[PDB]
Ligand binder design. Structure first.
Ligand code: CA
Ligand code: CA
Length: 169
């Protein structure tokens, strides 16, 4: 079955689907160095809970969804995530599998759900959040994977990079 490897070095391919479910006009977006460097690479994607330039506080419910997948005996997903700004790091997200369609309502099996945590002597810390790697088992018959930024507000960005799916298959 499917191997998928996406480094986001040239944005979000049209074969991926984005859903701005909350309807504010802000969804998952391409990021690149120097503003928004990827993991060991130039490009990534990001989603905002606060926008620069007067945009202000947001309440995202934003989906980034893979192309269709062929996983008759399941597979393994890995990806990298961080908080863009270590002082505003508490972004919440979940990863879902659908066996059916690729609408928001088809993503109900949360495989992974978490709020990012920032990593007594006074010491200078990183400006940007540390990249962490996540590994998720994908059930047999999974056709789409969704990354959902939601139940988040008034932090900064969540960044996502280097998505790999290996079929068992
Ligand atoms: Ca990248
Ligand atoms: Ca939105």
């Amino acid at each position: 079955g499917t191997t998928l490897s996406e480094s986001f070095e040239n944005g979000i391919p049209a074969s991926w689907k984005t859903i701005d479910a909350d309807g504010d006009g802000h969804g998952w977006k391409p990021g690149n160095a120097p503003g928004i460097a990827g993991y060991n690479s130039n490009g990534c994607v990001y989603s905002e809970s606060f926008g620069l330039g007067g945009i202000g506080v947001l309440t995202p419910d934003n989906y980034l969804i893979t192309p269709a997948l062929d996983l008759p005996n399941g597979g393994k997903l890995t990806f990298w995530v961080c908080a863009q700004d270590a002082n505003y790091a508490s972004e919440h997200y979940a990863v879902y599998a659908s066996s059916t369609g690729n609408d928001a309502s088809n993503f109900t099996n949360a495989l992974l759900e978490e709020t990012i945590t920032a990593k007594p002597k006074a010491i200078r810390g990183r400006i940007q959040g540390t990249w962490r790697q996540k590994t998720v088992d994908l059930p047999a018959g999974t056709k789409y994977v969704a990354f959902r930024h939601f139940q988040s507000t008034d932090m900064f960005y969540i960044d996502l990079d280097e998505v790999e799916i290996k079929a068992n298959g």
